[PDB]
């Protein structure tokens, strides 16, 4: 069916090169990766304590 | 009457949709804030060191003024 995993050179000239260099010079995407867990911290966890609460089952 | 498991698709959950997109930062605009904070950083800092000079000369003047010491 074909889907292709390779990007085949995202940077070409001037504008497309600098932003691909900016993420490697400092971080940016690591700070963006930091934000993924940041919002994940605030949302309520699905946890069941066994001696009081019980997990889902079936007939 | 026969009752079995019914079929339901409705929205089809959208087969393979991209969620990753460029947000906040553009490229050239981040350097204007980045280097812009640096130029604002030095100008604010060096003015305090010039105000430190007002204290500095006045501190060493106390030693010259004190000769009975």
The resolution, in angstroms to one decimal, equals 5.6
**Gyration radius of chain A over CA positions:** 22
Q: What are the tokens at B20?
A: 């990753």
Cross-chain residue pair A28–B25, CB shorter than 8 Å: yes
Could you report how far apart the first and last alpha carbons of chain A are, in Å?
A: 41
Q: What are the tokens at A58?
A: 């079936």
Q: Kindly tell me the burial class for residue A34, based on how many C-beta atoms sit within 10 Å of its own C-beta (0-12, 13-18, 19 or more).
A: exposed
Which residue of chain B has the CA closest to A26? B34
If phi over 0 gives left and psi between -120 and 50 gives alpha, with beta otherwise, what is residue A10?
alpha
Is the separation of the CB atoms in A18 and B27 below 8 Å? yes
The residue whose two tokens read 């990753």 is B20
Positive or negative: CA dihedral A59, B6, B11, B15: positive
Cross-chain residue pair A18–B30, CB shorter than 8 Å: no
Cross-chain residue pair B25–A18, CB shorter than 8 Å: no
Burial B30-55 (b: 16+ CB within 10 A, else e): beeeeeeeeeeeeeeeeeeeeeeeee
């Amino acid at each position: 069916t074909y889907k292709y995993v390779n990007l085949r050179e995202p940077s070409m000239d001037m504008k497309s090169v600098t932003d691909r260099a900016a993420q490697t010079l400092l971080w940016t995407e690591l700070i963006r990766g930091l934000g993924m867990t940041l919002s994940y911290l605030f949302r309520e966890p699905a946890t069941i304590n066994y001696p009081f609460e019980k997990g889902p089952l079936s007939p | 009457x026969x009752x079995x498991x019914x079929x339901x698709x409705x929205x089809x959950x959208x087969x393979x949709x991209x969620x990753x997109x460029x947000x906040x930062x553009x490229g050239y605009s981040m350097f204007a804030v980045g280097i812009g904070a640096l130029l604002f950083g030095y100008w604010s800092m060096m003015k305090w060191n010039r105000e430190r000079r007002r204290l500095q000369i006045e501190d060493f003047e106390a030693r010259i003024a004190l000769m009975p010491l």
